[PDB]
Design a protein around this ligand. Structure first.
Ligand SMILES: [Ca+2]
Ligand SMILES: [Ca+2]
Ligand SMILES: [Ca+2]
Ligand SMILES: [Ca+2]
Ligand SMILES: [Cl-]
Ligand SMILES: [Cl-]
Ligand SMILES: [Cl-]
Ligand SMILES: [Cl-]
Ligand SMILES: [Cl-]
Ligand SMILES: [Cl-]
Lengths: 118, 118, 118, 118, 118
């Protein structure tokens, strides 16, 4: 299996977006977070973030932001891959979450979506 | 609390946009500013700016600009996080404001915008 | 003939998209994959990927991504040029494919897409 | 007042756009120009340009281009700040103009545009 | 006159787009090409290309691509400035053309496009 691709939520929509700049530790950072819904429900893990100078995978900040904003704009069904309990800044996690955004793929029906499944 | 996230206006719309180049002191800079409305109302702080080579957070000029431009285009409800009394160039503050743009988040209703609240 | 331009699918549509970050071997990478259809049909080779730090051609990651995203949005008829059996990470190829994305061109009719043909 | 912000036209529209590459003297450059209208009229100064490797302010080429292209698309009322008779290449000024683009801001009415005013 | 601005097609439409990666000599390159129509007719010169690491003007690849994609999206009347017989890769010219894209400008009517004329 593809490392860090075993945790995901399928057929969700990105219905909120946060983008901001923020100092954490000794690093000046950028971050964004997606807020998730699944139809009228709010999924268990519903806030996922990516930070430019922190994380399991620091590459792809701009591309991941553009991708998320695009799906925010369309409101289409997606699968979000993420990694839990990454962020150590307790102020950041309380306001948002500890989840790191790993990947986003598109969905054509219930439980297909592009990408690896368990 | 997340430092610099304690000051914000919720459920506003970005109804004006400025982008320009400008020399301040001896430094060549870029800046943009968002102008705010709240329905027919004008919020306490209504002009917020970001500058590429100045400010409490220099990172993220391009992403913040594209993000602001997007919300200007849709005119949707957003929350604006900002920092007061930042800019020391009195020519700039008189023309725009002393406010530095920190973050922009989306709103799902008149009771929910993404991000930390007081 | 143009090297790497001898394998392609004409008049297909991009109907799915994946973007992600991933450690492959000893490298931190970004990737995306397009999923292809031909009307209601799914061609035998239907998944094509590009990776920023791996492949026969590492250049053009951002531009190819933006290009792929535009055509996903319009859903218009395109020709996809690709190279088979490139990726050696069996975790990746099993979840996605071994195909490398080389070029995308638009189509004017059922008989004509821009670019070189066999 | 903000240096280089004393010359502008309020409530004009960008109704034409030029982007190109060009060798000027011994330098390889990019440039773009906006062409202006004011309703059904053409203002006295109606062509304003920005060049990547020349000018009073070389910074912000890509951001200014994107900014201008957006207003070209919306055709909305803007205020254009510019500096006259900057470019010295007479082939260029004859084809386009000698004006350097400094800033673009939006207008809510014929009595309000964002930015410093006289 | 502006060197390399003496050859152009006025009031054409970009009706096709090619983007790709390709090795030429010892250079890994990106290229794109626009395909041109003039209403229902196909103009004498109908394929014009720009290559990131080759040409009379290597600068402005991303910006020229963005510009071309924009006019492809709108299908609007443009003027294309180009240079003939530039590419020496005969496999490339056979697939596309020997034409280098120099500039693209907009047209407000059937007798006016922005930029210098003969
Ligand atoms: Ca909303
Ligand atoms: Ca087509
Ligand atoms: Ca409009
Ligand atoms: Ca307006
Ligand atoms: Cl959560
Ligand atoms: Cl204010
Ligand atoms: Cl496949
Ligand atoms: Cl002023
Ligand atoms: Cl003029
Ligand atoms: Cl041709």
């Amino acid at each position: 299996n593809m490392a860090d691709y075993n945790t995901y939520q399928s057929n969700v929509q990105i219905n909120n977006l946060s983008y901001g700049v923020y100092r954490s530790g000794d690093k000046e950072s950028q971050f964004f977070c997606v807020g998730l819904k699944r139809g009228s429900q709010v999924p268990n893990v519903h806030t996922i973030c990516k930070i430019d100078v922190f994380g399991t995978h620091k590459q792809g900040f701009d591309n991941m932001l553009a991708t998320a904003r695009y799906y925010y704009a369309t409101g289409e069904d997606v699968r979000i891959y993420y990694k839990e309990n990454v962020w150590t800044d307790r102020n950041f996690t309380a306001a948002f979450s500890g989840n790191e955004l790993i990947a986003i793929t598109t969905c054509t029906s219930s439980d297909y979506c592009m990408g690896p499944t368990l």
